[PDB]
Design a protein around this ligand. Structure first.
Ligand SMILES: Cc1ncsc1-c1ccc([C@H](C)NC(=O)[C@@H]2C[C@@H](O)CN2C(=O)[C@@H](c2cc(O[C@@H](C)CN3CC[C@@H](N4CCN5c6cc(-c7ccccc7O)nnc6NC[C@H]5C4)C3)no2)C(C)C)cc1
Ligand SMILES: Cc1ncsc1-c1ccc([C@H](C)NC(=O)[C@@H]2C[C@@H](O)CN2C(=O)[C@@H](c2cc(O[C@@H](C)CN3CC[C@@H](N4CCN5c6cc(-c7ccccc7O)nnc6NC[C@H]5C4)C3)no2)C(C)C)cc1
Ligand SMILES: Cc1ncsc1-c1ccc([C@H](C)NC(=O)[C@@H]2C[C@@H](O)CN2C(=O)[C@@H](c2cc(O[C@@H](C)CN3CC[C@@H](N4CCN5c6cc(-c7ccccc7O)nnc6NC[C@H]5C4)C3)no2)C(C)C)cc1
Lengths: 146, 88, 109, 104, 91, 148, 92, 148, 149, 89, 103, 109
């Protein structure tokens, strides 16, 4: 397991700031590197959260499981606090591919049983059916580091 | 350096070459052309496909928080088709 | 004065509400900074109910108005850091009301 | 929506899991990882029917309720020799001895 | 990682290493100095070693797992030989 | 009120979703404001870290329909005895046929179209009154002022 | 004892008295002054609806005070509206 | 060491049998003697009217095989909070493949015939060592003298 | 000088995000601990800047030198960058005292030569005249750190 | 815990006691051996806004949600500055 | 959250509110503080009658219209022994005409 | 011998891998049983890296082969119990390989 938190015993105060228009699901990777869902952040708010140094986090659209960004990257790892200053996690939309973005909208308008009714190619139908997923994306992020 | 994308109905769209290249399929059709013709893409769609190029080029690598690329229901399906056909 | 100061501080601590629960026990000792770094970043002058018993033995408080000034300071320190409706918030509102009735019984009767 | 599988070719048997939502192609890639033969040299069967690389295991017929860890569903495997694929052949496991009379 | 367990008749069983390590005796054979990916059981037939793997699948899956676990089924026909195999392995 | 009192003493709990629905666990904070937590898929069960005296509530993540935990509306973990985990069994209640019908109609018809259904206006108003955590919390308080 | 509920089309539904009483409207019609007579007639409720209304009585009676999991009472889209109407009229 | 505590304070409990087996609830008396109680069929649940501090244990009514309640071996009801009932979730543990096999062999072969099975001597002893509440209680005592 | 940057030689990529309605003046404390003005951030913008680990920063209203906050505190010191991920400095309004806030508005409406025409107390006149300043605030921050160390 | 602030023109303002205490001068006047306080010098249009600040300060101090500017109209600015200084807000 | 100023003729209440909370719940909060039972006052949204059980959200109070430093202003009435009171809107004190120095 | 025993135990602790992270950070202090009751039900003879520094001062280890016997015991108390391929499991495989190179440099050079 390449992508995992590190047991540290040193607390790190963090500010999760949701500057996406969506409800955000913070996802803490455990020491085994298994995603752990945490309480959702409503759009346009922030919370101070108690995490630990070296702990690895990831953020996503609580509804669609769409990919988000934190400090213009995909993973957030709190640094050691400097003189008690809280670290800041700025959560934002990425620039989705036109395709992925369209899928998002179609998926949001059409019931999954009706994907069948759209006059589109089978490949597109499969893409519509293939909902985004933290685990699939974690596997991809490993190969992008390997 | 600008490039001409032409819709099925025959509208002409003049957009920066670099903006267009965001599409792998356009990259393929051009690279090895100044005009490209889309027999299956109507204007109301190809217009919005360009608007995405504008958006992607501008907001990729922005520290300033990125805004949602809006798609109206009326255009969603045809855009998804066009989007898939284009590599973007 | 020390006998009177102990009667007032011990009445506020020993004070139980009308469900039998003691309000003071969580205000009796402050947390470590390791535990809660947010209180020690947001609260200026941290003081507890054992740091008041400490300053009653060391005779740092010269009058019953100097003992009150620092019981209002921690009860007000709690209110900022905790929420308006929090269980800890409204008990520091009651601990100020039970200190202001405890000093009024011992100092003049 | 997890499925537990035995992918078997001849005397070889691979024990692995996959999502209902995962695809026949992704499964061929897992086999590639183990048996070192690409997805274009593999054919995967559910019983005697050939499975299209593009379909989800779900759509092929595999479900969580019939692919449980202790009763894995069997996906048949065939490799390609030259221009033709071998027949799907899954050599059966050994028979147990008749029940001793004491276990009647 | 995947490990190869080979039955007496000569069937090959490719199972995850973590699933296999559930057997203390296999843990010993692998973590020992040896000379691994393969382990050979000359006295365990396939119809048994197949089911031994199915248990690994089961054990790994339904452990560190809470509200309900299902019965690990064993048919009479296999029960005795499995019990033997089971003992010879740590579980 | 629905206080969810600070304990500082951890209470290991098992959230078991034995409803057919996706379950939204809702923790009441110290101020007593509902806090959405990660959803439980139907037929799933997980160990969660909560604290003694913390007050929880469960609902259909989609419809915000009312669920039950241990045949009641609120769950408050007891202090663990000898480290043994507490169990929160989340289930459907027996909804009235009416409320159940509303649920189904609401799930099939877009809220802006409730007006188009050839039903009585009273039923339309009932459809429009979507279930809601806050409304239900207010009701549970008056049910505690009524036990006073 | 049992009780007879009769639909508009004229189907007869014989259900346990206690099962039927789940409906306040029925409770009223039966307990209203032989006395507590067996039959009640619904001129505006068709069979495909009143059939399902009974199925609910069966369900409610059975699964009320069941300690572990209860299963979803299913309602098909085709019947949903008319059932909602019937449900409200019955008070069940 | 291991016994119920006379309390006089009632604690409503829900025994939920989520094992595939018939479950024998076993109440430890104040003297600490196991007391068999009425069996729970698989997939059933009952409200039980026990008392605070009373210690319970669950087992396969037939084989006397060990079960789990709330992923542990003993269940002790906490005092009810707000009238809410405690929940005892009874399930299979993940038996070792060996112990599981023993269970099946033991269920098929009469104990006097264990001698006829063409197996290793150690296994003969293992089959003969039938699971037992008292043996397990003795073990649990030494596990509580080891944690103090 | 207790409050100063630390010579580090380890670069730290940072994102200055101005989430105040005002033009922001980033102020880098030098190794001697002397404030150094840097290029201003327009409201609602964010840029990636190259700084070093242990370097101490401070932010202020470029126009009037009013005090701002970064990550809910007064000073920002970049952590060592981890795996290329940039550190984030979120710059915001503080909760100004009602007085200081009023001064801000009056100062913005009335020419400094006319502060004397306002029917206010002389003390208030002095307060109006006393424009906020980085150095005064640095001195205050030191006395606020002599109680913690 | 609510408290009554009374303006010169005689308007009554009921605000949480804790909200009011944000003013050192009020804290002084209230603390020690009263729930009404009278401001002979402060008109309503001012004391109203002074309260609105208490609301603002209490709510947004220590809040992770980015803080909005506390607006002051020119017409009220000077009298508020006076009131602000007297109160120690 | 929604921030509100409830005014009688001479009196002004600044208080907390939830968008999701209802006009009824709000009357009860006032009852708790002004010590007069919930049924005896009727509430006005800009001088119009307010529905006894609608959520402040539905009444029109939003984040954008009811901020802590710009609370949304809703009218309160004392009806005593069947007395109907027309809304008496006492103004707050007026500010002096804008000084030449600020303009 | 104590100077040599400290050089070997301090080198294994201070040892960072080729990403800059210290491996011994998790092994420095064993967890409490309250925290993790499984480690104390499955591991027979629990020992950490501070319980080895404790036994270097108390002189319980008589040779450099007795110090090694209990560094292999904790590193194996990982290997028997712990997940193969886990973050801690491979570190105890490396901490045995860095102890066997650290004793081989100090004891003979
Ligand atoms: C996977 C999945 N699936 C479906 S759901 C789910 C899931 C579920 C949960 C989680 C996450 C991990 N878990 C949670 O969210 C849990 C659950 C629910 O219970 C809330 N909670 C939380 O974590 C809150 C929380 C944490 C906390 O911990 C304190 C008790 C311990 N803290 C140290 C110190 C103490 N207090 C000490 C005095 N202190 C003060 C003292 C004073 C004072 C004293 C003396 C004199 C003067 C004084 O002023 N003043 N003020 C004080 N204020 C602070 C107080 C702190 C607190 N309690 O609750 C978190 C979210 C808030 C993930 C997935
Ligand atoms: C259907 C189904 N399916 C699956 S299971 C199941 C099922 C479930 C339940 C039941 C049945 C209905 N329920 C049970 O079996 C339950 C369950 C389990 O918990 C044991 N139990 C029992 O009922 C025992 C039991 C009953 C009892 O009741 C006392 C608390 C009430 N008592 C009044 C008085 C007080 N004590 C007060 C001091 N007192 C003494 C005082 C003194 C003393 C005092 C002062 C000065 C000098 C003195 O000497 N001395 N000695 C005292 N001893 C007595 C004591 C009494 C408690 N508690 O436990 C029964 C079996 C014993 C069935 C199936
Ligand atoms: C409001 C809101 N909104 C959106 S999100 C949110 C929110 C955010 C946060 C919280 C709450 C308050 N905060 C959190 O939940 C934070 C955050 C995130 O960073 C995880 N975390 C936690 O609290 C976990 C946590 C705590 C911990 O501290 C360790 C250093 C100390 N722990 C004990 C000791 C160590 N041990 C590590 C070896 N491990 C052992 C393993 C083995 C072993 C291994 C393999 C094989 C065999 C073995 O035996 N052996 N011994 C071990 N020792 C003990 C054990 C544990 C960990 N780290 O993470 C908590 C949940 C676990 C709330 C809301």
């Amino acid at each position: 397991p390449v992508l995992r938190s590190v047991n540290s015993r040193e607390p790190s105060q963090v500010i999760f700031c949701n500057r996406s228009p969506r409800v955000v699901l913070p996802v803490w990777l455990n020491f085994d590197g298994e995603p752990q869902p945490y309480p959702t952040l409503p759009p346009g708010t922030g919370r101070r959260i108690h995490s630990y140094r070296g702990h690895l986090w990831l953020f996503r659209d609580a509804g669609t499981h769409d990919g988000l960004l934190v400090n213009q990257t995909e993973l957030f790892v709190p640094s050691l606090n400097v003189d008690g200053q809280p670290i800041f996690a700025n959560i934002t939309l990425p620039v989705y591919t036109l395709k992925e973005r369209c899928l998002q909208v179609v998926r949001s308008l059409v019931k999954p049983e009706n994907y069948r009714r759209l006059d589109i190619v089978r490949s597109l139908y499969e893409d519509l059916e293939d909902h985004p997923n933290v685990q699939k994306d974690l596997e991809r992020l490993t190969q992008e580091r390997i | 350096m600008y490039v001409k994308l032409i819709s099925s109905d025959g509208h002409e769209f003049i957009v920066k070459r670099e903006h267009a290249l965001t599409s792998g399929t356009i990259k393929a059709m051009l690279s090895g052309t100044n005009e490209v013709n889309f027999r299956e893409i109507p204007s109301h769609v190809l217009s919005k496909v360009c608007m995405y190029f504008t958006y992607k080029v501008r907001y990729t690598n922005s520290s300033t928080e990125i805004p949602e690329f809006p798609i109206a229901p009326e255009i969603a399906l045809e855009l998804l088709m066009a989007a898939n056909f284009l590599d973007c | 004065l020390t006998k009177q100061m102990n009667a007032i501080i011990d009445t506020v601590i020993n004070y139980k509400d009308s469900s039998g629960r003691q309000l003071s026990e969580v205000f009796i000792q402050l947390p470590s900074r390791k535990e809660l770094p947010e209180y020690y970043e947001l609260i200026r002058k941290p003081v507890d109910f054992k740091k008041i018993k400490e300053r009653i033995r060391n005779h740092k408080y010269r009058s019953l108005g100097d003992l009150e000034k620092d019981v209002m300071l921690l009860c007000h320190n709690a209110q900022t850091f905790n929420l308006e409706g929090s269980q800890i918030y409204e008990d520091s509102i009651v601990l100020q009301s039970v200190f202001k009735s405890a000093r009024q019984k011992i100092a003049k009767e | 929506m997890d499925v537990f599988l035995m992918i078997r070719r001849h005397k070889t048997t691979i024990f692995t899991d996959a999502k209902e939502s995962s695809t026949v192609f992704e499964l061929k890639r897992i086999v590639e990882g183990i048996l070192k033969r690409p997805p274009d040299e593999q054919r995967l069967y559910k019983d005697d029917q050939l499975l299209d690389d593009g379909k989800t295991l779900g759509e092929c017929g595999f479900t969580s309720q019939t692919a449980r860890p202790q009763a894995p569903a069997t996906v048949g495997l065939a490799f390609r020799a030259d221009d033709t694929f071998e027949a799907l052949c899954i050599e059966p496991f050994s028979s147990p001895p008749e029940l001793p009379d004491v276990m009647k």
